[PDB]
Each structure stands twice: as C-alpha cells, then as structure tokens.
C-alpha cells in the first residue's frame, strides 16, 4: 500500500523547525461529528440536571466486577480524574484545564500520572450514553468528582456546565521538551534551566505528571524542596498557600494509594495497549490488578483512617503522629506513622475485617515540615469549618478557573456570587444610536492609526485556551493594563481622554466605544479605497470596575510581542514568527485570516512605535492590498539588515525601498503563506481582500462575546 | 511562550506506529482561503485561453535579470518544470501528479530533483497574478510545458484546464522509507528488498528523485542497469517502451544539463532556505549561480547542437558519435562524444560565439545500449514523423493521467478523441421512471447483502489520486474485475444476471440499477429499523464497454483488501486498519463517515465470505446503532484468537458471544475513532445514526460523478 498510515511519516522530519501551522487548523467540518446547526449550549440547559445527580450519586457505589470500587466506592477515584481533569491549567498561556475533555485523548490518556483514569472515564460511559448530547463529556468529567464530594460528606460550592467536547487532541499544547516519561532534572533536554528555575511557561516538575512528584523531588524525599516544587506548580496553576493546601489536604481527606503489586508488570499506557484492551491501559493480564492486589502510584496506602467519608482524618494524622520513609510493597518513598493505633488504621479494600496502613506523600509531608504551610495546616485543623470552606471554593475555582466569564456558565447549581478569577463584567447598554456614536467619533482630530489601534488592542488580549481576556469590560483603561508598553499608554491615554467623554456622553460602554472606534477607522481606510461597507456591530459590552480586576492575574495577558503591530518587547529566544503562530492561535483565527490581519493593519500604519517596517504602501491609512503586492514582487531583494530587520531593495537600482520584519517577511517565504499572500495579490482580488480582511476584524472584535 | 509552534513538537513522538487520521481531515474550510460558493470547474470557462498563450509565449524569452534564461529562452526549464510536475505520478495508488500543483508545497518544492523549479514557479507568478482565480497554479504549470513545446517548434496533441489546487501538502502520500536525501540503495531504511526489488508501490530508485538516477544505479555509469531502473519506474507511472524513449528523448531534445560550477556552494533548498530568499531555494551568495555559472543537476552541456529548437539532433548525437565517460566541472559521471565536430557544438548560454559540449545521461545512454529501447531509438531517427506524434500524445497522457475522466476536462484544446486511458465511459439514460426500476429491484428473490455488496463492490474501486475508479461505466460486470476474488464473482453474476435484464427491460444503464440496487437494499434494511426514507438518487450514468477498458491498467483497483467488508486477500504486513485508513482516504471519506459505514455495513450482513466477525445484532439485515452499542459495552470482553481475529467474551459467562477482526475493534480501541462510536451508540442518536450512515454511503455512490 502507498499512503501515510502511521503518524511519524511527516514532513516534519526533513524540517523540524518549520512553522506548525497546522494548529490554526483544528476542530474543523471533518473532525467533527456533530451537524452544523448542533449547539451544545443551547442543548445542555434541556439536561435534567437532577436525574444526572441521581445517577452519578448511583454510580459511586455500583462497583463493577471488571474494575471493583475500593470499599464499593468509587468516589476516591472520580475526584482524582477531576482533579487531574483540571491538573493541567497553567496560567501563562491559559492552556491545558478541565475545560475540553482533552484527557480521553491522548497524549493526556496515557500519561503516568493519568494512570488507571482510564477506567474512571469508562465507568462513566453508560451515564453519558444515556444522557446522550445534552452532556458533553468534558462536563460529565468536571462533574464526577463534585458529586462524588457531596457523596462523600462534603458541601460543595456549585457547579457550572456548558465545556463542549473537542475530536481530538489540542495540538496547540507544549507539554515540556522532554523525550521520555518522567526523567530526571538533568538529561540532554531537561526543562529546568539555571538556579533550578522551571522555564516559565509550564507548570509540572517532568513530562506527564500533572503538578510535582510524589517520592519527593527527584525520587529523592524532601518535604522542604517538595514544599517549593508545590508552592510554584500549584502557583502556575493559579492557587495560592491557602488554597494549595485546602486542596491537598481536601484530596487527601478521601482515598488510597495503590502500590500493591509489580509496577513493571502492567501493561502498556492507553496509547501503546493493542486494540484487544478496549482502548483502556496499564492492564495486567499476568496476575489480578483488580481491588486488593492493585498497582496505580506505586506507593500504598490511605491517608486517613475512614477513606469514603469527608472528616478531620487528614490533619489529625498528619498533626499528631510523627513519620518516616519506608517502601511500598511496588518500591517507593512514603512515609508512615511510628506505631499508630489499629482504630487509626484503613481497613482493607476488599475485606474490612483486615486493617492496612496509613501514608503521606512527600507532598503531604512538606504541609506539615514547610513553615508557611504549617501555619496554614494548623489553622485548618483547629477549625474545620474554614478549612471545608475554603477547599469548596478552591475546588470549584480549580473546576472553573478555565471557562472564563459567567456568561458562559450554565445550569441550576452556579454561584450567583462573583469571583474575581471570573474577571467580571457588567451588561452593557444593549440598545442607544449607534449611528450617533460613529458620527461623534468620526468627529474628533483622531487618526485610523490611533483608532485602530485601540480597539485591536483592548481586543488582542483573548485567548481561548481559558476564555480570558477581550475587547468587553474595557480592561485597557483601567490599570494594569493602561500601563504596559506594547499598550502604547500615551497614545492609549489620548484616545481614551476623547473617546471616554464620547462615551460619557452617549450611555454606550468605553468598551462598545473603543471598539466601534476601531470599526469607523476601517471604514474610513476602506472607503478612501473606494470601497464603502458598513462593518457589523455587537453593541452591549460592559465596563468592568478596577474593584473586580486582579491585577496581578492580569499580567500574564500582557502584549511582550504582537506581529499584527510590529511589536517586540524584547529579543526573546522563540523567532517572532513562532511568536505570532501562538498568539494567533489563542486568538482563534485560521492561518489565511492571520494572513490577511497582518495585510491591513500594515498598510493602515498600526505598527507599534510609528515604525515603518512592512508598510508597502504611498496610501498609508488606505485599506489595499498593496502589502501582498510588493511583498510577492521580485522587482524586490531582501537584505538582512540584522536582528529581526530587513530592507528591502530594488535589483536594478539597489536603493532600498521599504524596512520589514521576520513576521512581514514570513508571508513572502513560507509556502502556505505565500501560498495565501499570492491569492490576495491577484489582480482579480481587491474586493476579496477587503470583504475578507473585515471578516477577521469583526472575528477578533466579537472574540469575548458569550450572549 | 507555551504553543507548539514548530512542526516536531507532536503526540507522534511517543507513539510513532498510531494510526494517521489526519490526512483524512485534509483541505478543510479553515486552510481553503476562498469563499464557500467558490467553484473552479465554471471559473476557469470565463478564463481568456488565447491571450494566455499569447503571454506564456511571451515568457519563454522575456528572460529576467535575477534569474536569466538560457539564451533568452526559459523553454527548457519551463518542460522541465512540467515534467517534474507530472513524474511523481504512480499507477499502484495513483498519488503524485501534475493534478494538485503539490510541487509548489513541500516537501516537493525542495526534492533535490525539482532543484531550481523553484525559478521557474515564481517566473509564471506574474501571469498567475493577472489571470487570478480563472487560472490555478496546478493548471498554469501543466501548462507551461506545453506552450513551451509549441513555441519551440512542437505540434502538442492538446490540454484540458480543471485542475483545482491545494493549500498545504498531500500528507496522505508516503514517498518512501529514506532519512536523508539520494542515498545508496542499501542503508538501514532501503526501499529495495530481495532481488534488488523496488517495494511494490514507490516509482522512484531513491528519496528525492523523480523516476532514476542520471550518473547510473547508485552513482556507478552502467547503460544496461539503468536501463532496466528506466523501464521498472516509467512502468509505474503508466509509461510502456515507446513512450519511454520517446519522451525521454523528447525532453532532451531540448534544453541543458547545468553544472558550471560547485554544487555544495549553493544555498539550502526552500523549506531549509531563511525568510531572506522569498522562498526561493537553492541559492548562491557566495558567487553567481545565474545565467553561465549556474549549477543545478551537476551535470553539464546540452543533448544537441540546437537546444532552443525542436529537431532531430537527440537521435541524431546519440547513434552517429560514440561516448565516453567524463566528469563535469561540478563533478558527475557523463558521457560525451569523443572527438566531435564544431558545427555540433551547443553555443554558450551568454555569448552565442562560444561552443561549448553535449552530454548524455546515463539514462540516455540506456536508450542506445538497451537492445529494446534501441530499436526504438532506431524508429524514432529514421521516422520523425512518427516520433514527433508519439511524443505528443505521451506528454499529453504525461499531463493528464491523473485527471481521470473527460467529463472533468476543460477549455478549447481537448482532444475530441477517447484515449484508452481516460477510462471512457458513455453519458447515461438521464431520465426514465427511477420508481418503477425500483419496483422491479424490489421484487427479485435478492437479499440486502446482495443488493448491498454488488452496488457497494462497483462504487468503491473509486479513488481521487487519480480519479479513476467508481460505480460509473458498470466496469465491474467486465473483465478483469468480475473474476476478482474480493469481489466474489459468484454472488456478482447471480446479481448481475437480474440487474442486467431488469436494466434491458427498462433503458436505465447497468450502472444505474447496480447503484439503485444498493439504495434499496438500504432503504429495505432502514424501514425495517421503523425508519422509512428515500434513498437521494443520480442517474445518467453510461456503460462502458470492454473495448474502451484496459483491463492490465485495471489491476491496480483490484481490491485486495476491504475493511468495509471484511475482505483480506492475504495477510499483508501493513496492519489491516492503517489499510482501511488507505483505502476510505482514496475514497474521499472523513474519519466519521467511515465510522459509520462499518456500523451500517456490519449489521446489513455485507461482510465478504458470509463471514459474521463484527456482526453483533440479532436483527441481521436492519440498519441500527447496534454494532456501536455492543462494541462499547463493557459486559464483554475481547480475547486474540489468533491473526486478525478475536473473540467477543460475557464476563461473567465467559461465553463467546460474537467474533471479529482488527477493521472491527480498531472503532473501540482508538481514542478519536472510540469517541465517534460512544457518540453513535448514545441513546438518542438511532437517527443520526441512521440519517449519518445514509450521506456516507451516497457520498461514496456519486464519487466519480463529474456531471
Ligand atoms: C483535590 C484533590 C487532590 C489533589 C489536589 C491532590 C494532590 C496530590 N496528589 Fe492526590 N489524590 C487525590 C486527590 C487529590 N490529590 C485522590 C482523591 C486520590 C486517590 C483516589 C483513589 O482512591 O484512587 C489521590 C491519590 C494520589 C495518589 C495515589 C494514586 C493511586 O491510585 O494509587 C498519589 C501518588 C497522589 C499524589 C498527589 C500529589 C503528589 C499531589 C500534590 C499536591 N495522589
Ligand atoms: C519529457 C521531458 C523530459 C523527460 C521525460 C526527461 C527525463 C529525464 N531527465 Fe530530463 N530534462 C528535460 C526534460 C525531460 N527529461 C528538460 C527539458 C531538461 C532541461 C531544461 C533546462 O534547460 O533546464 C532536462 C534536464 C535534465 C537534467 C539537467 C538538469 C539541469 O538543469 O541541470 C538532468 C540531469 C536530467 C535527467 C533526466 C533523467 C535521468 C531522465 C530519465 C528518463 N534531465
Ligand atoms: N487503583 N485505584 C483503584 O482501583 C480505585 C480507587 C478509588 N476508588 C475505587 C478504585
Ligand atoms: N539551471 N537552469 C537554468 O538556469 C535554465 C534552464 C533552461 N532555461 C533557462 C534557464
Ligand atoms: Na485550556
Ligand atoms: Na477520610
Ligand atoms: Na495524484
Ligand atoms: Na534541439
């Protein structure tokens, strides 16, 4: 046979570097099953959320014979599938969360530490079919381990629904550089560079674990380089020394480790398993690896004396006795008490009348040996009640932190309270003249470069990784924001000084405003080039107060590079095309709309700083597809001018014509790229260009639009 | 930043032998950039096909100063171009071709072959930019060639237009195991096992060549190997001994070898070369590499004392003067005459006052030393005429093998004439009582799996590669293909001898009751699920008679493995799901159509032998979800029963409920196709189900439809 059949038959492998422009490109007609009027949002509120309750409650304690419950319940298990549903979330990017159903796919299926999850997926199965599509299973997954905490004794916070399923895996994910699972902090391709410092853009220690390891750093127990190893994950993750130990504690206080048997001795991860295991993983066909005689950490054990019921276990354990290493039965670090009583010991899984032992993770440990969190750990133990409190909250932030606003939020159990990690946003004046507002707007000595500028800029903030960021609530007013220097804060306070009276005046949000603001200048280009539209319009945007603002969550939105200005804050070590890709990404366009983005704002003179690099153009502020032009023309050589610059030459004459960057250059030697440049420099394609440059515009204006 | 912005960051790094479902998903809405009512087929009509030629001719001698043509003739690089274009065509799978514009992507863009096409691409960007959407770029480089031939003396036996392009590459295409680049044909990954044997579906001798190498087999002069390599490979792209020698001496009849100079010193190929070269390749900074001292094969000189001209002079060198090996001045083994005239001397590229020499190929020299090819060689001297006729229509079929049928050609210059290779096929009965041959369908003593397995045989020969293949011209009644195992010629002639009649008594075209045969077999097995539908339906299609069908060429159809079925021939070493993947690729299917088209197939009893592996129902014959809901119900479990079989196994029992194979639980293993299968057999979806089974197989049905 003659075609690509395996996945490592690429052209990757010739040109390793090359743009992955392929990531623009997920989730489309042909992955999808679905129909193309099907909206899962709409469908999910005709669920019957009490029934789902029911059932999920039911299921906790129906063990199945092909994978029997511990105690016949399951609920240990079904909260650490959410938890680890959730484990991935990293703020720097948004990326990773609870939010997609990414982990029934791989790579996430078949990670280490995802290890038997497997099976908590597929014990869910039969709920999800009988609910069918009014329950994604991103949903039901983000559920699982809430339920079972209500089973288990605890008053959770609530519960959102509306997470719509994907068809594959997030592409877009950089996991960690690493080759093989699990490795040491030094090999050829470590993540750790320097004074120990995890590269900045990730949250776990190694490659498929979700947040530190369990023997300590390295195999190696410490519960005080544990306790900072935590301390910057759990961070990464948006969780605080309050929160961080709420959780553990919170986890903990339910469930066994399991690390009776031979590791070494279980199949292979989901991915790697044949088609005979149902596409479930690590299975032992050798020896049981059913309830008792069962492998999944390595280390063995419960943390507490009743595993199946919220209670003060946890502390009360980790408080009272004193503990030292020993060795799993599988051949790990744990730590155990030194002679405990036997009414303090877990019984067994499958017959109670047989009492087994206790364990804490180095994890557990550095709560108790870390001075910080000892403090906390102590406060949560003389008062429970705060402690069951806070972990509700954490629970249901560490569930949520990813599906951005509340507008999105769906279904009876959602806290009408606000959280400021929901970056809030009051409604906006649905209804006032928008015509009046453009025609005030238009009125002020306020060029297209300052007015598209703005509106791009309140707009380029969102991601869709965790649904933050956008053009509503008008965030760039307020501080952190109207400060940062890619932001262009004067000509930003310019603007905003006008166009906040404008909108004082009117009763329509700073937010609608600076947005149409954007909106007019186009226009305005667009008609100078003889082509007049009226580009759409979605008034309705509130203006959030710097009350509900976290400023320090918001920095890590901020613009250190933006291609569609010509923007570089540094010389960072990612090329600033590679740079543009991932912004792009997260914006949600495709790679022919990022084609066309970067065509006009050209030539309507947006490049940050008044520079001049890409502006292929003597009708600057004209909406043409002049960039195209002279960019695909070989009248043109193209000199490195060094470090992220070029000129550009005329053959004959060798003057030099314009200046341009890497991201303007990318168009003219990528072939998909130019592939698109090219089509967009056709003679035949003036209105094309324009129509479809307005498309992308609007795209990018309504990116943080959920009503 | 945390995006996986280069090409290798990817999940096939950990899991290399996985199945490749992307090239399923391929040229989808988000990388086609035109609109959504954008067709090519009526565009191109509008297209001024005259004043195009006026400019191809044009170019040909508008040689430009950053890359200046031969003698201010870009004809021989313009052929060349068109050839390379053409030679990645191959006749097991019909991938490769001129019918995409593939070349202008990687990794062909970069193949050491297609060394400077890169040139001639950007040369024609001009002409593509004035003529915009009416002229593809895969149209306008089949083109090329051939304006070419004609400007340079050449009567071309005509062109059709109507090949639409692409925006990435064909990832559904596999090229051949190699690593690097022109290896030997013995290094850890060879494409050549046993006796020397080109694996079975590959049309080059090594990686980055287009069908042999030109210094000999694996750099070592030999006539008579090489001559044997030239007859293997053209034979796999369709070329018999005639047409061999005809167009290779056709090619060279024109046009130089370049190799003035060092070959290292030249740049990296495209993909490899930095934003700086417009995406060019291969270029020099170093020193010139236009014009004289240009370096591309290595090798150096031209066939004939007139390379601007069509004329005799390649037959004219190669059987007067003998031949000797040399070395150019870039260093490769070439022959040259011993001891020439002036007069036959091929001036210089510059200055038309200096002789330079003539070469020969190893290749050409294989046409001489050959006893075969020199008989031909023979002909073609002493009968211009004829050479000159048969090279025209070879170059033609070279240009349009993969088309497929004339329906789909274009424009003024198409051959009125049928060429055995257009597979021909008369136009149908258009309209006649369709509910009255389903009337009589209906009445014969004929089962769903007999109606169904015929009409599904017939439709699935098609491919797009190279669009031969389909329900359409009934070629299945014919031989070879009604004595193919797979498509049991029992069963068939037992339908066929009912259809036939039933088709005579009616007018309606054999093709379109073995096609309504299927609709209604479904339509049966659908009402009895208590879903009554009609079945879409296209008539028109013609008969094709045994005369206008070359049944050699028809092997390459031959199915020898339907997963859709559950047909193997034999047991192949590629897994018998990667080739299902193949073969629904060729089809044109997505991942999810051919998730349920197994679904649908399997319970309508169409597996091949009357073998029941992957039937799980009771209600055989009734089109329902139940393969879906029993292939994801954890009451069984799936044991090996040895090459490609398992057995279905009741837990608790341990009773064998059912049997099946790979293509089976390939569905229920795999996590993105498992996802498709829980989603069908979800409660609610016996409708969509249903409904989605029924476009699928429609879609299949009018594959070749070009009308
Ligand atoms: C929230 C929640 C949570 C959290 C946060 C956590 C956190 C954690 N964790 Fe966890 N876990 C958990 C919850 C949890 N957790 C659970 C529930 C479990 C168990 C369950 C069962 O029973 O399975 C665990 C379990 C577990 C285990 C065992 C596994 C088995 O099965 O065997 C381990 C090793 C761990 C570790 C850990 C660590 C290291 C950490 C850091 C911090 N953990
Ligand atoms: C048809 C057509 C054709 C064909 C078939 C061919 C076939 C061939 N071929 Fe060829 N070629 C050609 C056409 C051709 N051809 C041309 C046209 C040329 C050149 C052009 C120029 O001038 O560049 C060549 C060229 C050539 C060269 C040179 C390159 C440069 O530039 O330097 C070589 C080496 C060759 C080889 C060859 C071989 C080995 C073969 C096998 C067979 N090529
Ligand atoms: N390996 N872990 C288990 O088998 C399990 C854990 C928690 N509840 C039920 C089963
Ligand atoms: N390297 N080949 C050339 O430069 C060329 C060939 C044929 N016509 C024009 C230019
Ligand atoms: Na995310
Ligand atoms: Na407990
Ligand atoms: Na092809
Ligand atoms: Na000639």
Redesign the pocket.
């Known amino acids: 046979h003659g075609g690509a059949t395996t996945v490592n038959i690429s052209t990757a492998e010739w040109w390793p570097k090359a743009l992955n422009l392929d990531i623009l490109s997920q989730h489309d007609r042909k992955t999808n099953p679905m129909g193309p009027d099907f909206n899962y949002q709409e469908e999910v509120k005709k669920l019957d959320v009490a029934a789902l309750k029911q059932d999920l409650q039911a299921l906790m304690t129906d063990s199945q014979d092909w994978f029997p419950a511990?105690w016949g319940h399951y609920?240990?298990?079904?909260?650490?599938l959410?938890?680890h549903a959730a484990?991935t979330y990293r703020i720097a990017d948004g990326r990773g969360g609870a939010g997609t159903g990414n982990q029934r796919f791989a790579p996430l299926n078949s990670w280490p530490?995802n290890?038997?999850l497997d099976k908590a997926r597929r014990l869910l199965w039969p709920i999800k079919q009988k609910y069918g599509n009014k329950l994604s299973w991103a949903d039901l997954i983000a559920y699982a381990?809430t339920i079972?905490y209500e089973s288990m004794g605890l008053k959770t916070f609530g519960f959102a629904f509306g997470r719509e399923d994907i068809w594959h895996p997030e592409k877009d994910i950089y996991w960690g550089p690493e080759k093989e699972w699990v490795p040491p902090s030094t090999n050829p391709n470590s993540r750790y560079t320097g004074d120990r410092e995890l590269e900045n853009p990730l949250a776990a220690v190694t490659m498929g674990?979700?947040?530190?390891?369990?023997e300590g750093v390295d195999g190696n127990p410490d519960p005080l380089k544990?306790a900072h190893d935590?301390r910057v994950?759990?961070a990464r993750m948006a969780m605080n020394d309050e929160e961080?130990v709420a959780?553990?504690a919170?986890?903990?206080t339910?469930?066994?480790?399991?690390?009776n048997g031979n590791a070494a001795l279980l199949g292979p991860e989901p991915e790697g398993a044949d088609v005979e295991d149902q596409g479930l993983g690590w299975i032992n066909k050798t020896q049981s690896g059913i309830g008792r005689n069962?492998?999944?950490?390595?280390?063995?054990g419960?943390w507490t004396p009743h595993?199946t019921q919220w209670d003060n276990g946890y502390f009360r354990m980790l408080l009272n006795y004193d503990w030292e290493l020993k060795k799993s039965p599988a051949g790990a670090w744990q730590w155990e008490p030194i002679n405990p009583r036997e009414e303090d010991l877990p019984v067994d899984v499958e017959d109670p009348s047989i009492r087994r032992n206790l364990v804490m993770?180095?994890?557990?440990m550095?709560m108790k040996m870390d001075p910080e969190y000892r403090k906390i750990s102590e406060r949560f133990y003389q008062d429970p009640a705060y402690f069951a409190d806070v972990?509700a909250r954490?629970?249901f932030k560490?569930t949520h932190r990813d599906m951005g606003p509340k507008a999105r939020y769906i279904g009876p159990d959602v806290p009408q309270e606000d959280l400021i990690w929901q970056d809030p946003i009051p409604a906006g004046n649905r209804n006032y003249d928008v015509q009046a507002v453009k025609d005030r707007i238009a009125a002020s000595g306020l060029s297209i470069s300052e007015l598209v500028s703005t509106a791009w800029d309140s707009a380029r903030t969102y991601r869709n990784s965790d649904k933050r960021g956008g053009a509503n609530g008008a965030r760039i007013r307020l501080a952190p924001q109207k400060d940062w220097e890619g932001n262009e804060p004067d000509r930003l306070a310019k603007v905003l000084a006008v166009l906040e009276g404008i909108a004082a005046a009117t009763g329509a949000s700073v937010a609608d405003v600076i947005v149409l603001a954007g909106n007019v200048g186009v226009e305005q280009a667009a008609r100078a080039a003889g082509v007049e539209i009226v580009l759409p319009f979605a008034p309705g945007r509130g203006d959030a107060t710097a009350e509900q603002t976290d400023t320090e969550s918001f920095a890590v939105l901020e613009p250190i590079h933006d291609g569609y200005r010509n923007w570089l804050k540094q010389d960072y070590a990612a090329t600033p095309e590679e740079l543009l890709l991932d912004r792009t990404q997260l914006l949600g366009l495709t790679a022919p709309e990022m084609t066309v983005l970067i065509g006009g704002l050209r030539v309507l003179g947006t490049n940050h700083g008044g520079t001049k690099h890409g502006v292929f153009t003597d009708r600057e502020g004209v909406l043409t597809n002049d960039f195209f032009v002279n960019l695909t023309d070989m009248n043109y050589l193209w000199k490195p001018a060094g470090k992220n610059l070029y000129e550009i030459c005329d053959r004959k004459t060798n003057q030099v014509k314009w200046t341009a960057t890497r991201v303007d250059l990318v168009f003219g030697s990528n072939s998909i790229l130019r592939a698109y440049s090219e089509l967009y420099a056709q003679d035949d394609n003036k209105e094309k260009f324009v129509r479809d440059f307005v498309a992308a515009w609007t795209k990018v204006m309504n990116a943080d639009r959920f009503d």
């Not at 069962?294 to 063995?300: F, K, W």
């Not at 993770?361 to 557990?364: C, E, K, L």
């Open positions: 511990d609920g240990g298990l079904m909260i650490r959410t938890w484990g530490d290890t038997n381990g079972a674990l979700i947040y530190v390891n369990p544990t935590v994950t759990f961080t959780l553990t919170g986890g903990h339910v469930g066994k480790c399991h690390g069962a492998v999944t950490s390595g280390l063995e419960a595993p993770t180095d994890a557990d550095a972990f954490a629970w560490l």
